[PDB]
């Protein structure tokens, strides 16, 4: 079984590079074409380059001259993407993809590499809870939640009861505020004779800061 | 060099029934080997693209025999005999005959469903939000069709600008709707100067527009 493991998501200032590497394993390295492929939230699809295993030659997209340079080591079985004078217009999600027909389209990716291009400071969310009331009531349902407030970068992921409540939840994408931090909520919509019984506390993981935090949303 | 062109952009199928999806490309696309190499990916949210379709027409393995691809020149069309609600995402043409390779803009495939209404929560800030400075009141549409909607934000009856962020999930997998989180942002001060706060909720499930409101303290 192929296997393309990359590595860990990155925060860049303005003017700085990122070096992603591409380990590959399970088949011969010199079989298969290696392209990087980047999006930017929200974005498409961007072909960045074709890397030749064997004669380690990059075929480049124009649009990166002078800015990306694809590498790959032999003796590691490891695909390189450097990308330099990093600007807000660089904040991807950056893929490494193989052909594993032999041709020069892809069909096998890694899991992506998030770079994140920001003057921002990496941190935590402060978690605010969205108290059911009677202005939150539709004929036996109630709706509840959580504000996950002034994080960066991405990702954060929340869960409800630590997974034991998926029914009826949305967690909303995340805004970009104009302080350069991310908000989000999540919310769930519960029976309403459950809020003196039942408890909800919404769990906001934020891995990039190393912060988790349980929330306890008690009704109004 | 190549550019990639997808008509329709979006599209809403009842699942049962067909979809087309076309790909144009500037300039021919013929390898150097004769080959025409337009492929289709299907990519769903928070995952990396799948290879559906290669060389125009083959299927990929494990890819259903409803799925299939023609064409000749520049112009490609994907179809999808009978939608499936699993067919949802963003698909995209691609071509790898001639360098640099090129993805179309993409062209999302959503479930067309019957219109709801959506239910509308409005919430205060929290008391602790409040006690670092910060005041952030949180309107929700929940569990409509189609996405099309507005959100209007008044405090003390005066229309609010600028001051508010939306967000909208991707369509439910096991009902096919919509949910929207309008946060309006004030400061403390600012908030504790008013009393009445509403969000009015425009959608074509509602006959009239439908405002959920609280007054301050209350």
């Known amino acids: 079984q192929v296997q393309l493991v990359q590595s860990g998501a990155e925060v860049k200032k303005p003017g700085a590079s990122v070096k992603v590497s591409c380990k590959a394993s399970?088949?011969?390295?010199?079989?298969?074409?290696m392209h990087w492929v980047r999006q930017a939230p929200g974005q498409g699809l961007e072909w960045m380059g074709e890397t030749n295993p064997r004669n380690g030659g990059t075929t480049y997209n124009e649009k990166f001259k002078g800015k990306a340079t694809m590498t790959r080591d032999t003796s590691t079985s490891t695909a390189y993407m450097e990308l330099s004078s990093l600007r807000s217009e660089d904040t991807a999600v950056y893929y490494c993809?193989?052909?594993?027909?032999?041709?020069?389209?892809?069909?096998?990716w890694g899991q992506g590499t998030l770079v994140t291009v920001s003057s921002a400071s990496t941190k935590g969310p402060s978690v605010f809870p969205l108290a059911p009331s009677s202005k939150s009531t539709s004929g036996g349902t109630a709706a509840l939640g959580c504000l996950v407030k002034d994080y960066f970068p991405e990702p954060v992921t929340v869960s409800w009861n630590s997974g034991a409540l998926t029914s009826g939840v949305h967690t909303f994408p995340a805004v970009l505020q104009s302080s350069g931090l991310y908000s989000l909520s999540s919310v769930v919509t519960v029976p309403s004779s459950s809020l003196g019984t039942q408890t909800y506390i919404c769990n906001v993981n934020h891995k990039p800061s190393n912060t988790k935090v349980d929330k306890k949303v008690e009704p109004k | 060099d190549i550019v990639m062109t997808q008509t329709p952009l979006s599209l809403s199928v009842t699942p049962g029934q067909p979809a087309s999806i076309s790909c144009r490309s500037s300039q021919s696309i013929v390898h150097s080997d004769g080959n025409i190499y337009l492929e289709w990916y299907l990519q769903k949210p928070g995952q990396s693209p799948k290879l559906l379709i290669y060389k125009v027409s083959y299927r990929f393995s494990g890819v259903p025999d409803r799925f299939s691809g023609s064409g000749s020149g520049t112009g490609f069309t994907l179809k999808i005999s009978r939608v499936e609600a699993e067919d949802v995402g963003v698909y995209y043409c691609?071509?790898?005959?001639?360098?640099?390779?090129?993805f179309g803009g993409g062209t999302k495939l959503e479930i067309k469903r019957t219109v709801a209404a959506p239910s509308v929560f409005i919430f205060p800030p929290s008391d602790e939000q409040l006690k670092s400075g910060t005041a952030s009141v949180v309107c929700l549409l929940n569990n409509f069709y189609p996405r099309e909607a507005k959100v209007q934000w008044k405090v003390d009856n005066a229309l609010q600008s600028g001051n508010s962020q939306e967000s909208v999930t991707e369509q439910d997998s096991k009902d096919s709707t919509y949910s929207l989180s309008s946060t309006l942002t004030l400061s403390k001060a600012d908030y504790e100067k008013h009393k009445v706060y509403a969000c009015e909720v425009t959608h074509q499930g509602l006959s009239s527009p439908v405002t959920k409101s609280f007054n301050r303290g209350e």
């Open positions: 993809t193989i052909g594993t027909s032999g041709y020069d389209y892809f069909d096998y």
């Open positions: 399970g088949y011969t390295f010199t079989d298969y074409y």
């Open positions: 691609f071509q790898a005959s001639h360098v640099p390779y090129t």
